[PDB]
Design a protein around this ligand. Sequence first.
Ligand code: HEM
Length: 154
Amino acid sequence: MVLSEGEWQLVLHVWAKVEADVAGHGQDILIRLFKSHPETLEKFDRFKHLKTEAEMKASEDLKKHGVTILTALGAILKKKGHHEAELKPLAQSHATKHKIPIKYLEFISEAIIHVLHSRHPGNFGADAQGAMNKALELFRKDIAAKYKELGYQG
Ligand code: HEM
């Protein structure tokens, strides 16, 4: 797939708002993912034990990881499709060490779109949400193609 420059602009225009508070967005997004799809929390051996949303909000580790994830995602979006080098080490650790199924990457994509919609309504209208969805589908499609080359699948 290929986004047009106008679609990338819509993605980078709402992303520049997220980057005013990376840690807060990371927290929101992971908590939304863990509430919606609690099975995903099991992949994290460091947080796995958190029982409630208050415990999650209070976990410094969870917040740090959210920052990790969003910074890596932001660097991929900024490439505007030319992200091959960034995806390699990412597809290798998620397919071989962590073992994150594409299904989960869809679940977090949904969590990202939910939070942007809540926090940025004026910059996340329908066309911008479509473009963000297209940029995350692109990301999942390229990662899934690397997963296959690396031997991971199902
Ligand atoms: C937008 C999607 C994602 C991005 C860009 C991303 C990025 C990262 C980054 C950069 C790291 C640290 C470097 C490395 O281990 O590769 C990481 C580690 C990790 N990621 Fe992902 N990730 C994403 C989605 C997920 C999802 C959906 C899950 C789980 C349901 C997950 C589980 C983890 C785990 C278990 C680790 C290691 C945590 C720890 O340090 O122990 N990732 N991810």
